[PDB]
Amino acid sequence: THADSLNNLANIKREQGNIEEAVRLYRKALEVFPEFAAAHSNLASVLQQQGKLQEALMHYKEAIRISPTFADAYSNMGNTLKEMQDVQGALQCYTRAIQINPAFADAHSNLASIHKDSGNIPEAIASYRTALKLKPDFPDAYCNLAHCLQIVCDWTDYDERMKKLVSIVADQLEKNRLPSVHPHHSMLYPLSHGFRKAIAERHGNLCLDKINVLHKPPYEHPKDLKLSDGRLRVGYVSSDFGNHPTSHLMQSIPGMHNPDKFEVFCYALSPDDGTNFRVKVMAEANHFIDLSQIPCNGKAADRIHQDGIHILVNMNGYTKGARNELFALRPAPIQAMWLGYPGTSGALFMDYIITDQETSPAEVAEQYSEKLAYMPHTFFIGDHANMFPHLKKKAVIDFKSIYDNRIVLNGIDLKAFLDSLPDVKIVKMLNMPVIPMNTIAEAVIEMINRGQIQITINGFSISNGLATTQINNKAATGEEVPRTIIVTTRSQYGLPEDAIVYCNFNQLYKIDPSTLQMWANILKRVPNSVLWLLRFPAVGEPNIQQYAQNMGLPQNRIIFSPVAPKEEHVRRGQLADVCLDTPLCNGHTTGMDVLWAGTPMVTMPGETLASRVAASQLTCLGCLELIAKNRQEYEDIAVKLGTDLEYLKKVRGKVWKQRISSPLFNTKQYTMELERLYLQMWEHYAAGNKPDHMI
C-alpha cells in the first residue's frame, strides 16, 4: 500500500530530525489508509513531543481499537496519560499491555517508573529488573534502576554499575539519542564534566522542540529602565512557592529588594498550597503571578513579556514542576539560574548562573554552559534566622555535676524563664545558661521520661520537643516560630549521653561506598563515637547496617532516627557534636540547617558544583579549618574533633558566633549583593556586551 511507503518515509524523516516535515508524511499515510493501525500509533508518538496532549490519545485509542493486540500503543498511551496526570489510567494502560504481552519489557519499565514516582521503590526495582530480564539492552530501565539502588544505598556490584552507566551515556551521546541519566542524577555518577553538560544540553533541547510548534516570533526586549521608572524588573520563576526547601531559603529576599531601584515579580508555576511561605511571597513581592493558571507556555511567556522583565531568574532547573519551556521562549533579555538546581542547564536560553568562587572556581568552568555570576561570599542563603530565631540562644541542664549537646532548651521567652529560676549558672564559651539538677530539672526530666506533651513551670509553657506537631502544627512546619519553650534531649532520640555524636541528615542517596568507608574509619579511630543517620528512606537502614557489619562496625555504632518536621529536624542538630558532609553531593540545605544549630560540619569539596557547596558555606562562615583537601584530611579533621574535646568546644563556639556574625544568614546583605550583581549584568547588556563572566 502507499500508506506503508509514506509511513516508512515518515519514520526515517523523524530520525532525520525532520519531524516537522515527517508528521506530514504520517498524515499522508493515514489519508491513504484511514485505519492504518501502525500509522495512527507513531503519529501520536511523535505527537508525544507536546502538540495536543489529547491529540496523541485520539490516535493511540484508534490504533488500539483497530488492532486490539498492539501492546506498543498501550504502553505508549500510558506514558502519554502520565504527562496528562491520569495516573489511574496510565497504570491501567501499562498493566493492560503487560497482561496482553507478558514479554513486553517496556511496559514493566513504565510500571516500575510510576511505582518509583509513587515511592514504592522496592516495587519499581522489581519491575525494572523484570524489564531488564526481558530486554537486557534497555538503558532506560537500567539507569532508573541504578538511581533506585542509589536511593536505597544498594551498592551491590556498585563499581561495574557505574562503569556501565558511563558506557551507556557514551553510546547514547554518540547517536544524539536522549541520555537515560537525568541531569539531576548526573551529579551522583562518575562522569566527565563534558558528559554532564551534554546531558543537560539534550534535556534543554527537549523543551526547544516542544516550543517550535507555537512558531512564536522572537520577543522584543527592553533596552532601558526608562519605561520602568529606573527600576530593574526582575522576575523570579519557580514552582516551589510554598512548603518547599526553595521557599525556606529565600522567602525573605523578595521583600528585601530595594523598591526604589527594583521591581520584583514572582511567577509561580505551582498553585497556592495554603502555607505561610506562599502568603509571605505573595504579599511582600511587588507582583505575584500564578502561571499555574496559564498552562500554555506561549501564553505565559507572552505575559512575562508584557510585564517588562529585564532579568528572569530560573529557580527550578531540571527539577519537578519546572517549565523551562518558558525560558526557551526568551521572554526576557537577561536570563540566569539561581538556587534550586545544583548544576548547569547546558542550554542557550540560560545566559547566566549565580555562584561563588568556592562553589564554582574559575578552573571548574567549561562545566557550565552559562556565564558565571559571582556572589561576594556565597550563592547559598538561608532564612533560618527568621524561621527559627528561638535557636539563637540555648540553655542546658547539668545532669551529673558543661555539656551543651545532651539536654538543651530553646525558647523566645527563655530569658524570662531563666530569671524566674533561683540557681541559674552561666558558662562562658556570648555565654550559655545552665540549670543545676534541682526540682525544676526533675520536673522537666519526668516530662521527657513519661513522654508528657507539656508542663507548666512558674506559669511558663514547657514543651516536649517530640510533640511540637500536636502542640502547634504551624510551628513544627516552620511556618510559625514556636511561642513556647521546647526541651530537646539525646534520650529523646536514643543517643548515648557521654559519647561523640557524628551526624549527617542528608538523604541516603548522597552516600556512596567511599563516603561510608571514610566515616567507618572515623568511628574506629574515635572511641565512644556513634554515627547518627535518618531513615530517609527507611529501606536504606538495613543496607547501611549490613555494609557496616562487613566493615566491622557493630550495630549499635549507627543510630537511625525517623525524619522530623522542619523545626524539630533543625532543633535536633544541637544534640549532635559534629556533622559529616556527604562529599558526593554536599548537603546544601541540610548544611544550612546544621550550621544554624551550631554543629560544626566537616566537608571535602569535590569537582562538581554540588560537591563544592557547603565549602562555600563554611568559607563564608569563617571556619576554613573544617574543609578537607583529601580523604585523609577529612578523616583526620573528624577524628581530631571527636578526640580533642577542648578543640571541639572551641570550634563549636566559633560556629555558634559565626552563624550570626558572618554574612551567611544575613538575608538583607545577600539581597543587596544580589541587587548589585543584577545591575552589573544589566549594564553589560545595556552597553551591548553579550554575556561574559562577572567576577
Next chain:
Amino acid sequence: AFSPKYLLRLP
C-alpha cells in the same frame, strides 16, 4: 507510650 528511647535515672 510515645516516650524517650531510654529513660534518665534520677535520685
